[PDB]
């Protein structure tokens, strides 16, 4: 409660490459600019309106299978067209989940840890208080040792950055598309079908919804390229950390003056780096700040 | 009221496996992506609007008979692609239903026994903090014997995967179909419409939406694959604890020494399994682990 | 508030059989997988769609008439395939109702009881444990004479299982139907209309969405089976009762030693079944079981 | 605030009679089972598309005049055929009205006098019980003479009755009509349209959706006309009051003895009626109940 | 707060009078029970289903100007067909205004004196209880003289029956109308369509969904008819007093004996009415009555 | 909590700049003034319905490769006609953007200060209070050196007005076309199309909706060219900023007299900017306003 638990920079990356695919989806079929169908093939006059539908159906339907069309580019252009949606909606997911994983599995254990430190902390404050009118400092060296949380930290931050450079390759090769796929020639020949002669051998049939398609591939493509940057500098744990929101506290008395920093690639960098995010929270940080910069018995018994 | 009262293992799989087909259930007919109808019947170019929609409906209807119908693969391939989002609703609330068990059959017996040992060791490390300045072991070793609820959730778990397991078999079934099922040979021949020879003999049906429903078989199944191991896993429950959230409390004099494991298959270990996750919640543990990883009686005194 | 006061069988069973009719009519008519109308009749091509849609209309409104169509199992399957959701939903409607019953007649007849015998109980156990450092019983007593609300719940139970039979009845014989009572062979010949040349004597019409109903009504069915054991099973209140609950209290003084069991066919059985469900909610009864089975005086004032 | 303040069999009553309309009004026409329109109309298949439009609308409109149409039941039963779901409408309004009326009228007027009721009891249960270790009868002897509130009880009970049996005469007229009145014989020759030869004089329409209204009114009917002693029973309010609630409250001393009885046809019965669903509320009410059944001055002061 | 503010026949009378103008608004053109438009114009088999289109919507739009249209009853009657539910909800509004300006002008102008009023009342009676063990008359002497608020009660009664009674006149009118007012001639030749001679020169429009027009016109009169006696009696604020709220008042030995009675037609009399509707929720008016009626001095100091 | 935390200019021009284009954009395409598609191509009269909706679909489609359509103004106004409302939302995340970056970044960063400063402050008042009867003033000088937020301030506000001049570019080139570039010339002769002679070579296509959105465009550019100004007097932080909200609190003695004034351009001029918005909400600041304007140690010791 009250605690962010969360940095700033990785809960905007998250809302980010979440929204994005989701504000995709949204607009590449929101009846407010679209159009009727995905699909359209071309019929004969004398066909009626119930043989044009049959045609368009089972021309967009026989899209999966490559030996009724007779494309130029493939068919795997094709899959890539009546797919595109659920592949953006499969990448949201995925990008989704690690924040998940991370929510359930270290929101206590983040949690408790962050309490019990602000009340420490509070406490060496008011005994300050009291006593001129280090339990913290061992808790911060064990944590030094154990090497576990950053590790995961780690793990996650590197996942999501292979997924987000994953997507990426599949959004530059599909964008990367002829943008004449969106086209083809269909034949509704299979069974009973065949050895009739009142339909034409060839249906020439287009995808709509291509260009647009395209469109919101590039767009995401370059939001992901300038994302990736952020993720790549997020990795560097311990170089995010300024080691001074400890220097602080060391002009205290009862507080274990020379606190260590938070170098060595430990759960102690992951500590520090969730520190600095919460500690301007706390009533006691900007009272001794105050005595720090204008730095002092009489000031520290003034307040 | 503040305990998670089940695990995060089994809160993700029951989340992920009743989700996952109501998501691929609201996708495969979501207007977003998807064609008008699911059946198209070619019917000649004489008939009206009104003649070629009763073959729509008559040879969508009459998918379940198979003495009209003259399809390759047989009636059962038709027979699943008519009702494949029924079948994924079915095997989504035969997931969600053990769930609805468990939390109804045990969601107070194991919420009153929790709150009663946090009062218990909190009590003890009240006792013990207040007196330097066992009835938890009992009620464990009697625990011990009973072993009622552990057997339960092996068998909530063990139906679990059983459902998981006949849902791959169907889904990989009925992935391996033809992908030409989607088509067959309908006739509107029954009664009055026996005699008259304005009719065609036989009309071209194709069941639309096949291919989507393929892919989302193929999704479901590959993701249940995934997920089966972790309820495999899960069955396992001795091995699951980590017996160390008890030797931390040892060393506390008025608590008793040398706390028994959670060995033996009986409700200890699931006992056991629910403490881990919720004794991080409690405020004395942290205060002991800090004292018991830095050692003693006067950081004892100190807090 | 903080009472069940509803037994977790009898909710269940009442939730399933009420949602399940609930979810099968939502799920017959729904636009993911249903097609267009009920009824299509095939009228010749000289008609126009007017002339057509009026064949339609006049053929589903004159299927409750039986001297227009000429059908071969009778006008009670078209009757029945015309209106399947109204009995689905009376069906749920006559389920749901013996529930409003018994909370509208009995939420404060059991609240009231159920709280002043926890408040008794409670001050039992309050002064044992101030007196070591039967208005109860005599209540018992008296309801066992009072032979009143098991009646009423046996009597709920009971018509609530003839209306599950009735509806397996119904339901049976519903999907034995032929499944061609689905088409049958309407006449638009009434009034001006019946002088006329430019109509064909009968049209053939076929009712679609009869299938969806034959195999929603086999699911009813077979749920309803499965089902109806386990009232039949609650219909016996004695055996239910596990007679435990009370000779954990006699070990205490204060208590009136040997209480009496549940059995006898009385309103004291109803009362037992709704203890063992609430017994688990109250702070002594766990302070009780603890001292009972690891047993005794100095166990009962160390809390 | 805690007091229900309306009789259970007079809250299922009203919340009955006004539901059941309303839930046939929305599934009269509710598209998950009905058809299209409500008329039909068989127009030449020279007409265009919008001519057929026409004379539907025309045919429809003209159900009112029947200088045009030429039925054989008279013009009442299209009447009431086109304005089913309005007289339903119509019929559940008046019959919520009188709740209404109850409720503006009576809320405050009863909730006070209940409430000083019961303070005046828990006063004298107070005052026996710190005694051993009568207002409210005269204000009951006072409310004996007043015939103000029970005669407005039974008169919106009367109304309430009154309104049923109109609605059960209607509905039963209703439903007895020929079910062959749903269709008649129209004529757009109004105006400029009478001299021209392009037009057929008259046109078979049909109105369908008229099965559908009978059967709704059937079941409106046999409902109505099993609650209708219902609120028969419900007229007799002296003989609905047991009068038990007082001689409890006897046994006590403070109290006066002699406890006057509900008969009289008073607004002393009413509120006795009111009384007995609210007393069961009371904690005074059992702690004198167990007392009187099982008895006295030492089980008195023992609680 | 707590404090009704508005007279129960006044607050009543408001929601009838606004509902139902707004109930038969959403009932005149509901899909359950409409057809499709409000207009449809016979065009000759010839014309396309685009020129049919134009020839309804021009003679839709042309129903304003009468120097097209060749009517019988003049085009006052089109007028009012077109736009009736846009007079139905300026009737509503201008109904429900006055409510709002009461509400606007007078919510704290009457709580606060209502407050003060019942905290005097409140005090009196606190006096009187703990002396046998006039603030509020002179205030009421004061309000006798202040005749300004009863005038604006009986304004706003006044102009909201000249509201009513001239809304009743409109719709007896416009129920009075030949109800073949519904159908007229158009004609489409304004412009370059004067001279060519592909067109009829006349075509025969109906207008749809008059009828229900006049069914709900009919049903909102005979409304308002009945509705109008209530204003008419509310009218008369003196003659509502009843003058017995402040006789029971003077039992008390503090209170000022010989009140005042409501007679006088000023703002005392208005008081008089609010104090009538709250009195009943205040604790002492009952604590009071029960004496006077039933009598003195040992029933005021028993309570 | 109670802190605007938000200049009231720089939350009227974010909520005016990001609300208008999200306006523009729900009103340029809803059906209440709409029209069907936003292109249409005459087709010949001999083609059928899907033909005729073939060619609107490919000539809708094919409007981004320019190989197909000869237009007269190029394909970059075709490409800005079917990509309006994407371009606008572009726009409207873009301006929303900067204001999340300055909650997320600034909002405890603000939040703490602000509440140390106005406690800082009612400590000063209330120390003046009871003394008659500068922590502060170093902190300010201490934030006078740090030249930090005001930096990210005055980046914000630079970084929306290009943003804002960007988008003025864009609508004023958009609404500067020729008004007839709406419509085209386009062709379907691509694949097996190109080889027939049933189909004419070139079809004239039209893009509706193009004179709103033009109007749009002229709406939201006029619209900025009246914002902008705002911001860029927004950018001169030290002007805005009336340096007297402090010379108030130098009439208390123990207030560090002759404080100093917001000149400087450093954070101390943003931290007197959010100042003198909230400083109203202190209670301390009106009590001694009003001794200030009406002189004094009387006046003091009076309040």
Redesign the interface.
């Known amino acids: 409660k009250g605690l962010r638990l969360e940095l700033?920079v990785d809960?905007?990356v998250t809302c980010i490459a979440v929204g994005l695919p989701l504000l995709l989806?949204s607009?590449?079929?929101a009846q407010?600019?679209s159009?009727?169908?995905?699909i359209?093939?071309?019929?004969?006059?004398?066909?009626?309106?119930?043989?044009?539908?049959?045609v368009?159906?089972?021309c967009?339907?026989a899209?999966?299978?490559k030996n009724s069309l007779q494309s130029e580019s493939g068919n795997l252009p094709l899959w890539l067209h009546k797919?595109f949606?659920?592949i953006l909606?499969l990448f949201a997911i995925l990008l989704y989940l690690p924040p998940l994983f991370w929510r359930?599995?270290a929101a206590?254990?983040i949690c408790?840890?962050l309490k019990?430190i602000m009340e420490e902390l509070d406490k060496v404050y008011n005994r300050a208080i009291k006593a001129a009118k280090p339990?913290v400092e061992?808790?911060l060296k064990?944590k030094k040792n154990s090497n576990n949380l950053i590790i995961k930290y780690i793990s996650c931050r590197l996942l999501t950055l292979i997924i987000i450079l994953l997507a990426c390759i599949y959004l530059g090769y599909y964008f990367s598309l002829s943008?004449?796929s969106?086209?083809?020639?269909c034949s509704?020949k299979?069974?009973?079908?065949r050895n009739d002669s009142?339909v034409p051998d060839?249906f020439?049939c287009?995808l709509?919804?291509?260009?647009i398609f395209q469109?919101l591939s590039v767009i995401n493509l370059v939001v992901y390229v300038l994302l990736a940057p952020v993720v790549v500098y997020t990795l560097f744990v311990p170089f995010r950390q300024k080691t001074d929101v400890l220097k602080v506290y060391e002009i205290l008395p009862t507080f274990d003056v020379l606190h260590f920093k938070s170098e060595g690639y430990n759960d102690l960098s992951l500590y520090n780096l969730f520190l600095e995010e919460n500690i301007?929270?706390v009533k006691s940080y900007?009272?001794l700040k105050?005595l720090e910069?204008?730095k002092d018995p009489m000031?520290l018994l003034?307040?």
């Open positions: 700033a809960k905007m989806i607009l590449a079929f407010e600019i159009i009727g169908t995905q359209s093939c071309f019929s004969p006059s004398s066909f009626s309106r119930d043989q044009a539908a049959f368009d159906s089972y967009w339907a899209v999966q299978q797919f949606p659920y909606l359930f599995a206590p254990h408790s840890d019990f339990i061992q808790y064990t943008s004449l969106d086209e083809f020639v509704i299979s069974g009973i079908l009142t060839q020439q287009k709509i919804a291509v260009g469109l301007s929270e900007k009272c105050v910069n204008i000031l003034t307040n």
